[PDB]
Amino acid sequence: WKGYLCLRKRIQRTY
Amino acid sequence: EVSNPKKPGRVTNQLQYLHKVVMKALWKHQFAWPFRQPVDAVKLGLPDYHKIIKQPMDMGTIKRRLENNYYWAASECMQDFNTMFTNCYIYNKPTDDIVLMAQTLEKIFLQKVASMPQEEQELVVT
Structure with a gap:
């Protein structure tokens, strides 16, 4: 929810 | 793989x-x-x-x-679970948010494994 890797992981999830 | x-x-x-x-x-x-x-x-x-x-x-x-x-x-499968948790800890900082998510899943993992059948027995289909 705040980390670079976790947010980048979250962006790719919506794709 | x-x-x-x-x-x-x-x-x-x-x-x-x-x-x-x-x-x-x-x-x-x-x-x-x-x-x-x-x-x-x-x-x-x-x-x-x-x-x-x-x-x-x-x-x-x-x-x-x-x-x-x-x-x-089962030991081969539990090693995979341990490998997955270890990879998150090694790569990320101990204070990272993704590490807290892995530790939450690891505690649940260790909780469910504690109720596993004690002896491993093969299941054969007949």
């Missing part, structure tokens, strides 16, 4: 317990979504992940392995 024709696999009571009880409890957890797929180092811009982590592992890979009877014994 997921399938191997030259390596023997088995169905045991402990392996089916990991697939029916342990995996289903961790898979639907709210913190499970980062661990359901292999880490895509290209999409996430991680040029050092595969050079620090020598054996990637995710819940999706473990689940496919149980569904294909990849493992011979």
